């Protein structure tokens, strides 16, 4: 979604430093408001201490800052943050791999639903659309980016993802629960009807198509599960309390105290707490990692591109089962027909990558 | 890719020490430039303090160094680095196991696509090439090492991985998305056509070949996913900010202060911060682990050898379905035909490894 994969392909001098200059989906963009509020509260307190407090009040503030500073300890924050963010990242990738792709069903429907006639074409196209509909229905239930594009079931119809008859049949089935599973049932019935009409040879080929359907259903279920079962609220609150406890301590504890009073640890007054602000970006930015990935189907820069996926799948799906049904290129003899040990060429820049075969660690390299 | 597996086979005296003398894919090669910049910035600051600053300025620098040194804390860096590098290492191995291997399809196509005639040969060879093409297409999309070898679809054709007719059919199919999935559809269609021509006996055998194809498609999808879905940028920036914050503190904090002033902790002046430089190799090298494996398909020393894999797969693939179709050695009686409990020999060096059968922990060893 914010892909920088090609920038970090090699481990060169500025592989990671270069990324500090990027704004899209960056730490600056996510921390902006929070950082400013921190900056303000800090320098506000700083001026109150330098310009308002009396000599006697300043002595109390200095004693209060020493108290607060002794409680700004990251080690407990690092512990709970690391674990929580690890949990979020785990679910984040699991949710991605749970986005259903048509390609596996697409391959079977394209080759095993017979007929080069309009009905065979309508049959194959309708089967794929039942798959894409099972997906679009669940995606608009879990993704705010998709829902805002299909806010009502009418949008789904007008977008060409569901026919008005299907919508009628959809409404006809009375159920109080999410009907995303309906197209998945239609598919199995239509696949069986297709087999009875002789469009699907065996039951082995039919069950094979039914299996890939069931797999797609399990994908939609996983998406439903992660949307329904949030990370327990108590856990989320714990990590924000811990993080905020730290920044609360820093607000006062990290104040630059009087250099003249010579407090151990506060010998220099820089006015601006460089390292405390660097700690804020670290921990507030670290919390923002979880903050952004806790729901990867939202509208964040790094949230999944669910609407593009829908478009790509629609185009590719139909194309593979229609224009490509039993449509192959001209079979030719391959360029290595009479060559048992082909030696495919290398460009000038890639010849260093033509390596001898790795036989095993145990063998002597001679 | 940089395999030292045989060197670390045994846990001897210098099993790991020996590896500190290796340059290829080493910590020295990856840290070289960064270390020099650190070295320079350090000793530059060191000379400014020893030779330029006035007695009064030196006192401020010493107070500034005590401030910076109090913020060079590795514990928070260790937390975020360990977690981040673990995530990178996790994806690193997942991407490797996502590199498709022909061997499973290779075994089925070689034995279940009938015919010892030129067509049967062309059929089997074309089926394998559709698999290898599905792979090469995705590999050149995710690997810079491969792309620089196949920068254009013409390179793929001229290299013998795609026929010009296939390229024509390829172009004929209008789609704005990556067509790496095309050969995977052709395969299923060609496998079905082969079955209708009587070259594949049952549908059980056909579905079995279609399944191994779908698995290969899922492999290509995983590669696409890891290339598309980068580790969230904010997370990457967080760990570089944390690491750099530490080295910023060390640049000044780890300066050798005046021994005469007798600062607690700074009683000895060695001019060269041995342990601080050793800490740099540790953390900068630890960050380089993630820096190198975050994209294992690049051109790093330890990045995957994707071009060799392509070559090996091409050679082995065709060879197994052509020269090896229904081609077996002469069936003989095995050397242990009349021996129910064979006792295979051992070399002189390996006799210590002939052990009695492990029956279970519960049994008395007598």
């Amino acid at each position, epitope marked *: 979604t914010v892909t920088y994969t090609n920038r970090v392909a090699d481990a060169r001098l500025g592989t990671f430093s270069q990324l500090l200059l990027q704004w899209k989906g960056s730490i600056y963009k996510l921390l902006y408001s929070e950082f400013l509020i921190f900056i303000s509260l800090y320098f506000a307190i700083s001026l109150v201490y330098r310009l308002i407090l009396s000599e006697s009040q300043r002595l109390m503030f200095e004693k209060l800052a020493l108290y607060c500073n002794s409680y700004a300890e990251l080690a407990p924050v690092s512990a709970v943050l690391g674990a929580y963010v690890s949990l979020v990242v785990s679910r984040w990738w699991a949710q991605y791999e749970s986005i259903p792709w048509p390609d596996r069903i697409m391959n079977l429907v394209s080759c095993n639903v017979d007929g080069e006639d309009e009905y065979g074409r309508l049959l194959r196209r309708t089967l794929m659309r039942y798959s894409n509909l099972c997906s679009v229905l669940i995606l608009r239930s879990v993704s705010t980016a998709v829902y805002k594009r299909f806010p009502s079931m009418e949008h789904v119809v007008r977008a060409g993802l569901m026919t008005p008859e299907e919508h009628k049949k959809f409404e006809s089935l009375n159920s109080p629960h999410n009907k995303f599973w309906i197209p998945c049932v239609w598919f199995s019935n239509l696949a069986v009807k297709a087999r009875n009409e002789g469009r699907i040879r065996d039951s082995v080929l039919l069950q094979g198509i039914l299996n890939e359907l069931n797999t797609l259903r399990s994908q939609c279920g996983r998406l439903y599960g992660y949307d329904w079962i949030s990370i327990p609220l108590v856990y989320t609150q714990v990590v924000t309390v811990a993080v905020y406890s730290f920044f609360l301590a820093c607000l006062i504890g990290r104040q630059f105290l009087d250099p003249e009073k010579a407090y151990p640890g506060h010998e220099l007054d820089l006015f601006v707490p460089v390292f405390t602000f660097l700690q804020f970006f670290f921990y507030a930015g670290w919390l923002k990692v979880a903050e952004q990935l806790i729901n990867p189907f939202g509208e964040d820069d790094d949230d999944f591109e669910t609407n593009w996926l829908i478009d790509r799948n629609l185009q590719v799906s139909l194309m593979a089962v229609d224009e490509m049904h039993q449509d192959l290129p001209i079979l030719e003899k391959d360029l290595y027909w009479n060559e048992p040990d082909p030696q495919p*060429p*290398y460009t*000038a*820049a890639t*010849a*260093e990558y033509k390596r001898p075969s790795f036989l095993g660690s145990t063998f002597d390299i001679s | 890719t940089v395999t030292y597996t045989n060197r670390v086979a045994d846990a001897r005296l210098g099993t790991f020490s020996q590896l500190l003398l290796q340059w290829k894919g080493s910590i020295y090669k990856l840290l070289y430039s960064e270390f020099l910049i650190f070295i320079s910035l350090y000793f530059a600051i060191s000379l400014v303090y020893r030779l330029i600053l006035s007695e009064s300025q030196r006192l401020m620098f010493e107070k500034l160094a005590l401030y910076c040194n109090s913020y060079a804390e590795l514990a928070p860096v260790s937390a975020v680095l360990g977690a981040y590098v673990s995530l990178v290492v996790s994806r690193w191995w997942a991407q490797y196991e996502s590199i498709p291997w022909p061997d499973r399809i290779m075994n089925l196509v070689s034995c279940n696509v009938d015919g010892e005639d030129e067509y049967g040969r062309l059929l089997r060879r074309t089926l394998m090439r559709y698999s290898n093409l599905c792979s090469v297409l995705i590999l050149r999309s995710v690997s810079t090492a491969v792309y620089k070898r196949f*920068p254009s679809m013409e*390179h793929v054709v*001229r290299a013998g991985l795609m026929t010009p007719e296939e390229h024509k059919k390829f172009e004929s199919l209008n789609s704005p998305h990556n067509k790496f999935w095309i050969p995977c559809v052709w395969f299923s269609n060609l496998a079905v056509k082969a079955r209708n021509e009587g070259r594949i006996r049952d549908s059980v055998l056909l579905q079995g070949i279609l399944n191994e194809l779908n698995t290969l498609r899922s492999q290509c999808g995983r590669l696409y996913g890891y290339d598309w879905i980068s580790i969230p940028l904010v997370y990457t920036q967080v760990v570089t900010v944390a690491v750099y914050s530490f080295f910023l503190a060390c640049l000044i904090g780890r300066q050798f202060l005046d021994p005469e002033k007798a600062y607690p902790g700074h009683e000895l002046d060695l001019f060269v911060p041995v342990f601080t430089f050793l800490q740099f190799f540790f953390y900068a090298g630890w960050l380089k682990v993630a820096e190198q494996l975050i994209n294992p398909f690049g051109e790093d020393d330890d990045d995957f050898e994707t071009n060799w894999l392509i070559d090996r797969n091409l050679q082995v693939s065709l060879m197994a379905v052509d020269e090896m179709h229904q081609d077996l050695p002469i069936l003989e009686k095995d050397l242990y035909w009349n021996e129910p409990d064979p006792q295979p020999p051992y070399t002189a060096a390996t006799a210590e490894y002939k052990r009695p059968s492990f029956l279970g922990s519960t049994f008395d060893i007598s």
Partner: antibody
Amino acid sequence: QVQLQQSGPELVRPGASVKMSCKASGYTFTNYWMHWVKQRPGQALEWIGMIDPSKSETTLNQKFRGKATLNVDKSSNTAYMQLSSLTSEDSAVYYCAREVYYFDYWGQGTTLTVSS
Amino acid sequence: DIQMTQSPASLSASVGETVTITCRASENIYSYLTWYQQKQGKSPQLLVYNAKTLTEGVPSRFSGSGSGTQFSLKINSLQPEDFGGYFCQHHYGTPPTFGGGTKLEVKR
């Protein structure tokens, strides 16, 4: 049709610098590496270097390390080569070729003459 | 670097004849060799690539062979056009050094 149209012939005084062009057309500029070859009468063709149009990664010949410079303009689909500290020996015919495991398309050539 | 040694420096033959140019590699370059034809004043043209494969326009009378360190171009049944310059180039790595060349002149 693939066509590599280089700049016209050039004449410069020793010590100066020159920058010749090569405009490609009829194929995707960024998908093929661009090479530069030097042709002197009586000597064999010398490989100067190559350039990756996409990322402008250059790979020169050690023999031309300080003499040649490569860069491209993806927008205008043209490649450039700059020769510095020109001497009488830098006088020759300079080609730009497209690579596809081979040099299948060359330019007409740019004749460089260095004299006072 | 890989050294390309071409021979003969110049061959003289008349129409109808069959000549054979030879390029020898300093080290193993597998099948990574190309043959170019260059007529005085014009820019070179690709004849054979990948050691054996003929390019588009090249007539059947041209054929290449060899592998490893020994390659050869063979022009059977010469023509008037076939008279001019001929050189080879290896394509295994960087820099892709060229051959010395061969001047194919008419014999009278």
